[PDB]
Amino acid sequence: RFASVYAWNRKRISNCVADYSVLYNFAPFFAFKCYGVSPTKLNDLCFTN
Amino acid sequence: VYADSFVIRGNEVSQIAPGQTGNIADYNYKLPDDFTGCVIAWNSNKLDSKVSGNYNYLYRLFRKSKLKPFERDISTEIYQAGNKPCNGVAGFNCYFPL
């Protein structure tokens, strides 16, 4: 279950290994717009929070 | 002068433009960012449709890599998804691209 619209369920991801390929298990991807960074280079990057 | 003619649905007619992403604009036909020319679209439902329907037209939905501009990708290659190395099974986790 997901939350409502006015009260979103914010979560903070702590230190871990992030694989930006498991999310591709979802097929449709009606929109995958990435603004700050290019999606292709999403794997070869490191983030603070 | 080059002319490319084909048929699409209305909801994606806005998708044929430089610097735009989606399903038709990424898996079927991508224009260059510095493209020059014109685009024309007209309605053809009344004389290009059947009561039972027409299944002649198919569009690609899954592709391994992004399509470079002006590159036809006619290839009946079974999609590889999941962890099962399909060898032509065309079943679960291996979809029909078109």
PDB file of N, CA, C and O in Angstrom, chain A residues 14-40:
ATOM      1  N   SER A  14      20.199   5.051   3.854  1.00  0.00           N
ATOM      2  CA  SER A  14      21.482   5.165   4.531  1.00  0.00           C
ATOM      3  C   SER A  14      22.559   4.464   3.705  1.00  0.00           C
ATOM      4  O   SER A  14      22.345   4.100   2.546  1.00  0.00           O
ATOM      5  N   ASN A  15      23.735   4.270   4.297  1.00  0.00           N
ATOM      6  CA  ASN A  15      24.855   3.687   3.571  1.00  0.00           C
ATOM      7  C   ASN A  15      24.559   2.244   3.189  1.00  0.00           C
ATOM      8  O   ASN A  15      24.207   1.423   4.039  1.00  0.00           O
ATOM      9  N   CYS A  16      24.701   1.944   1.901  1.00  0.00           N
ATOM     10  CA  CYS A  16      24.494   0.605   1.365  1.00  0.00           C
ATOM     11  C   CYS A  16      24.960   0.613  -0.082  1.00  0.00           C
ATOM     12  O   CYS A  16      25.212   1.669  -0.667  1.00  0.00           O
ATOM     13  N   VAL A  17      25.076  -0.580  -0.652  1.00  0.00           N
ATOM     14  CA  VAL A  17      25.388  -0.717  -2.070  1.00  0.00           C
ATOM     15  C   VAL A  17      24.085  -0.633  -2.852  1.00  0.00           C
ATOM     16  O   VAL A  17      23.164  -1.427  -2.633  1.00  0.00           O
ATOM     17  N   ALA A  18      23.999   0.336  -3.757  1.00  0.00           N
ATOM     18  CA  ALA A  18      22.797   0.563  -4.544  1.00  0.00           C
ATOM     19  C   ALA A  18      23.028   0.067  -5.964  1.00  0.00           C
ATOM     20  O   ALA A  18      23.954   0.523  -6.644  1.00  0.00           O
ATOM     21  N   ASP A  19      22.190  -0.865  -6.406  1.00  0.00           N
ATOM     22  CA  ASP A  19      22.219  -1.375  -7.772  1.00  0.00           C
ATOM     23  C   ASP A  19      21.044  -0.763  -8.518  1.00  0.00           C
ATOM     24  O   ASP A  19      19.887  -1.110  -8.256  1.00  0.00           O
ATOM     25  N   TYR A  20      21.336   0.147  -9.444  1.00  0.00           N
ATOM     26  CA  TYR A  20      20.279   0.753 -10.241  1.00  0.00           C
ATOM     27  C   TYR A  20      19.955  -0.130 -11.437  1.00  0.00           C
ATOM     28  O   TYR A  20      19.931   0.336 -12.581  1.00  0.00           O
ATOM     29  N   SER A  21      19.707  -1.410 -11.173  1.00  0.00           N
ATOM     30  CA  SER A  21      19.219  -2.345 -12.174  1.00  0.00           C
ATOM     31  C   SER A  21      18.058  -3.196 -11.691  1.00  0.00           C
ATOM     32  O   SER A  21      17.315  -3.719 -12.528  1.00  0.00           O
ATOM     33  N   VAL A  22      17.877  -3.353 -10.378  1.00  0.00           N
ATOM     34  CA  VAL A  22      16.759  -4.136  -9.864  1.00  0.00           C
ATOM     35  C   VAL A  22      15.437  -3.448 -10.173  1.00  0.00           C
ATOM     36  O   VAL A  22      14.427  -4.110 -10.448  1.00  0.00           O
ATOM     37  N   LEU A  23      15.417  -2.113 -10.139  1.00  0.00           N
ATOM     38  CA  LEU A  23      14.191  -1.379 -10.437  1.00  0.00           C
ATOM     39  C   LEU A  23      13.707  -1.626 -11.857  1.00  0.00           C
ATOM     40  O   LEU A  23      12.527  -1.402 -12.144  1.00  0.00           O
ATOM     41  N   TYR A  24      14.584  -2.092 -12.745  1.00  0.00           N
ATOM     42  CA  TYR A  24      14.174  -2.427 -14.102  1.00  0.00           C
ATOM     43  C   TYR A  24      13.287  -3.661 -14.156  1.00  0.00           C
ATOM     44  O   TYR A  24      12.740  -3.960 -15.221  1.00  0.00           O
ATOM     45  N   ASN A  25      13.138  -4.382 -13.041  1.00  0.00           N
ATOM     46  CA  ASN A  25      12.175  -5.476 -12.984  1.00  0.00           C
ATOM     47  C   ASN A  25      10.752  -5.000 -13.247  1.00  0.00           C
ATOM     48  O   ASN A  25       9.900  -5.809 -13.632  1.00  0.00           O
ATOM     49  N   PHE A  26      10.477  -3.713 -13.043  1.00  0.00           N
ATOM     50  CA  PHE A  26       9.206  -3.119 -13.433  1.00  0.00           C
ATOM     51  C   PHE A  26       9.268  -2.766 -14.914  1.00  0.00           C
ATOM     52  O   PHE A  26      10.158  -2.025 -15.347  1.00  0.00           O
ATOM     53  N   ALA A  27       8.319  -3.302 -15.694  1.00  0.00           N
ATOM     54  CA  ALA A  27       8.416  -3.185 -17.149  1.00  0.00           C
ATOM     55  C   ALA A  27       8.006  -1.811 -17.668  1.00  0.00           C
ATOM     56  O   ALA A  27       8.823  -1.157 -18.338  1.00  0.00           O
ATOM     57  N   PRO A  28       6.771  -1.306 -17.414  1.00  0.00           N
ATOM     58  CA  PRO A  28       6.258  -0.185 -18.227  1.00  0.00           C
ATOM     59  C   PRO A  28       7.119   1.069 -18.208  1.00  0.00           C
ATOM     60  O   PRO A  28       7.586   1.508 -19.264  1.00  0.00           O
ATOM     61  N   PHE A  29       7.349   1.643 -17.025  1.00  0.00           N
ATOM     62  CA  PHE A  29       8.069   2.909 -16.881  1.00  0.00           C
ATOM     63  C   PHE A  29       7.449   3.992 -17.771  1.00  0.00           C
ATOM     64  O   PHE A  29       8.034   4.458 -18.753  1.00  0.00           O
ATOM     65  N   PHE A  30       6.220   4.359 -17.399  1.00  0.00           N
ATOM     66  CA  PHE A  30       5.484   5.393 -18.121  1.00  0.00           C
ATOM     67  C   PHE A  30       6.292   6.681 -18.230  1.00  0.00           C
ATOM     68  O   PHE A  30       6.186   7.407 -19.224  1.00  0.00           O
ATOM     69  N   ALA A  31       7.099   6.983 -17.215  1.00  0.00           N
ATOM     70  CA  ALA A  31       7.976   8.145 -17.253  1.00  0.00           C
ATOM     71  C   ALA A  31       9.221   7.845 -16.434  1.00  0.00           C
ATOM     72  O   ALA A  31       9.120   7.401 -15.288  1.00  0.00           O
ATOM     73  N   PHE A  32      10.388   8.088 -17.026  1.00  0.00           N
ATOM     74  CA  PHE A  32      11.673   7.894 -16.365  1.00  0.00           C
ATOM     75  C   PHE A  32      12.530   9.142 -16.506  1.00  0.00           C
ATOM     76  O   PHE A  32      13.736   9.069 -16.751  1.00  0.00           O
ATOM     77  N   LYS A  33      11.918  10.310 -16.346  1.00  0.00           N
ATOM     78  CA  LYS A  33      12.623  11.563 -16.576  1.00  0.00           C
ATOM     79  C   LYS A  33      13.605  11.831 -15.442  1.00  0.00           C
ATOM     80  O   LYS A  33      13.206  11.955 -14.281  1.00  0.00           O
ATOM     81  N   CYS A  34      14.887  11.920 -15.779  1.00  0.00           N
ATOM     82  CA  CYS A  34      15.934  12.264 -14.828  1.00  0.00           C
ATOM     83  C   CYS A  34      16.482  13.639 -15.180  1.00  0.00           C
ATOM     84  O   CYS A  34      16.872  13.878 -16.328  1.00  0.00           O
ATOM     85  N   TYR A  35      16.512  14.535 -14.196  1.00  0.00           N
ATOM     86  CA  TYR A  35      16.822  15.942 -14.437  1.00  0.00           C
ATOM     87  C   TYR A  35      18.269  16.289 -14.099  1.00  0.00           C
ATOM     88  O   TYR A  35      19.001  16.802 -14.949  1.00  0.00           O
ATOM     89  N   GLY A  36      18.690  16.029 -12.864  1.00  0.00           N
ATOM     90  CA  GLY A  36      20.038  16.400 -12.466  1.00  0.00           C
ATOM     91  C   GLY A  36      21.113  15.611 -13.188  1.00  0.00           C
ATOM     92  O   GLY A  36      22.135  16.169 -13.595  1.00  0.00           O
ATOM     93  N   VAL A  37      20.903  14.305 -13.355  1.00  0.00           N
ATOM     94  CA  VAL A  37      21.923  13.415 -13.892  1.00  0.00           C
ATOM     95  C   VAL A  37      21.342  12.598 -15.036  1.00  0.00           C
ATOM     96  O   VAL A  37      20.129  12.404 -15.145  1.00  0.00           O
ATOM     97  N   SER A  38      22.232  12.124 -15.899  1.00  0.00           N
ATOM     98  CA  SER A  38      21.838  11.232 -16.982  1.00  0.00           C
ATOM     99  C   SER A  38      21.606   9.829 -16.435  1.00  0.00           C
ATOM    100  O   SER A  38      22.443   9.321 -15.683  1.00  0.00           O
ATOM    101  N   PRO A  39      20.490   9.181 -16.779  1.00  0.00           N
ATOM    102  CA  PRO A  39      20.218   7.846 -16.215  1.00  0.00           C
ATOM    103  C   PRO A  39      21.287   6.817 -16.535  1.00  0.00           C
ATOM    104  O   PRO A  39      21.591   5.966 -15.689  1.00  0.00           O
ATOM    105  N   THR A  40      21.884   6.886 -17.727  1.00  0.00           N
ATOM    106  CA  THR A  40      22.843   5.866 -18.137  1.00  0.00           C
ATOM    107  C   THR A  40      24.034   5.810 -17.191  1.00  0.00           C
ATOM    108  O   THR A  40      24.518   4.724 -16.853  1.00  0.00           O
TER     109      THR A  40
END
